[PDB]
Structure formats: C-alpha cells, structure tokens
Design a protein around this ligand. Structure first.
Ligand code: NXL
Ligand code: NA
Ligand code: NA
Ligand code: NA
Ligand code: NA
Ligand code: NA
Length: 247
C-alpha cells in the first residue's frame, strides 16, 4: 500500500447504526488510501466467503478447476442454502457463494499447494491451520482490510503470482455491476454471529472502475445479529457516494 490517512468524519455512517467496523478506500491514480479507523484497518479477521477469490485462482492454477467452463455438479443431497442445490458454473458458485463447491476445491488443492499460494499472494497471516476445508471459515487464517485492498489491486493489475489468464477468469466471475463507463467487481462475506464477547465478521470487498479511474475498497464490521448484515453494503455505498464514486 501507498499512504493511508484516517478520516474520522466517515464514522458518521457507522455511529448512526452503532456499528464497530472499518472502511478502506484507495484511489489508484493518486496512490493514496483513506479509512475511518487506522487501527482497525490493519486488524486481521477471518476471510469467510471473501476467500473464494484466492481459492478460485488457486483452483485454476493447480488444475483442480479444469478450466473456466467447469460445471460443479450437485450430488442431490441436502446443502445448507437452497440456492446451492443445483449445478453451478464457476461464476455462479462465486455469485451465490456456494461454500460446498469451494470446500471441495480446497480439499483437492491440498494443504501444501494452498500454503504455497497464500505465501505467494501475501494473503493475510498465511496460517492455514484448522483443517484444509475450513481454515478460512473457522480456523486460524486472518486478513486485514489493508491486505484485502493490496491483494485486490494486484488482481486488478494481473500481478498476482498466477497466470494472467487465471486472474482474468476470476475477475469476470466477480463482476457485480456493468455499465458503459462504470464496472464493479465485488465479494461479500459473513463468518457468522460469533460467540459471547467474540463477534463474527461481515465483509464487502472489491473495486470500482469509473471512467479511467479505479478505486479499491474493503469493508468489515463486527456482527452478532444477522439482521445487521445489509450494513456491509449500505455503509460503504454511502461513503463511496459521498466521494462521488457512483454510476
Ligand atoms: C461466506 O461468507 N459465506 C457463504 C455465504 N456467503 O454469502 S455472503 O457472501 O452473502 O455472505 C453465506 C454466508 C457465509 C457462510 N455461511 O459461510
Ligand atoms: Na492506491
Ligand atoms: Na475473526
Ligand atoms: Na456509465
Ligand atoms: Na457486535
Ligand atoms: Na460519509
């Protein structure tokens, strides 16, 4: 990362909702970032479903995902969300956030190759302890909002230690809004409601391409009640709108 400046006026959008969280927003052309909370911007949290981004790249790199058009077939047995009970493409599995597809990717990648690529990607604390299929869900892996924006900038630039083709495949799978001069790539996550005195984490990370500028973003918040989940999009959206970053 370049420079980061704390702007505590952005806490307005958090206090209104009694949210403890952080937003990091970086403008590519000026090599500068801003945050409501410098200390929290570097604090590391479970990646939860945001881990689909590195995991998809790693699955392609290792050949476990055979190519961009692989279909992940449903075995017909119960899955935890109805939206996952179907065959899915790579983009569909990312977009509906189908955990079992990505747990099996991780199993097939295996611990040695997973460790290798998280070290190459400088991905968080790089700690894959807790089981090959769940280290990023309930194990020891942790990543900060600063590190998310660094990782996403590298992906945007095709500068991760992976083929350019595999980075491009994952990028199209992450498009969530497309207009002529406005394109958003993004991914949500939610580790759960935590335990007593130990909240869960909710995430929204991504980047916005508006005309010839690019803005990288990462939001996280403590969460202990699922009713608060939409704040992971609404608070960053309000901040980005106040910065003029909008269709
Ligand atoms: C990822 O964090 N998970 C899978 C699924 N993601 O949907 S989200 O991106 O809208 O948060 C549901 C939540 C979570 C999980 N249960 O593991
Ligand atoms: Na920057
Ligand atoms: Na955490
Ligand atoms: Na437009
Ligand atoms: Na909380
Ligand atoms: Na604001």
């Amino acid at each position: 990362m370049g420079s980061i400046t704390e702007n505590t006026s952005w806490n307005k959008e958090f206090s209104a909702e009694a949210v403890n969280g952080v937003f990091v927003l970086c403008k590519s052309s000026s090599k500068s970032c801003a945050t409501n909370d410098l200390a929290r911007a570097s604090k590391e949290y479970l990646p939860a479903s945001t881990f689909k981004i590195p995991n998809a790249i790693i699955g392609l790199e290792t050949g476990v995902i055979k190519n961009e058009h692989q279909v992940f077939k449903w075995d017909g047995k119960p899955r935890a969300m109805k939206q996952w009970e179907r065959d899915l493409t790579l983009r569909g599995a990312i977009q509906v956030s189908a955990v079992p597809v990505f747990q099996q990717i991780a199993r097939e990648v295996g611990e040695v190759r997973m460790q290798k690529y998280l070290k190459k990607f400088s991905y968080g604390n790089q700690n894959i302890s807790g089981g090959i299929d769940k280290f990023w869900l309930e194990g020891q892996l942790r990543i900060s909002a600063v590190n998310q924006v660094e990782f996403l900038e590298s992906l945007y630039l095709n500068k991760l230690s992976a083929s350019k083709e595999n980075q491009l495949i994952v990028k199209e799978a992450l498009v969530t809004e497309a207009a002529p001069e406005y394109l958003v790539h993004s991914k949500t996550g939610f580790s759960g409601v935590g335990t007593e005195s130990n909240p869960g984490v909710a995430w929204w990370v991504g980047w916005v391409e508006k005309e010839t500028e690019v803005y990288f973003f990462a939001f996280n918040m403590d969460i202990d009640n699922e009713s608060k989940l939409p704040l992971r999009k609404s608070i960053p959206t309000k901040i980005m709108e106040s910065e003029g970053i909008i269709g």
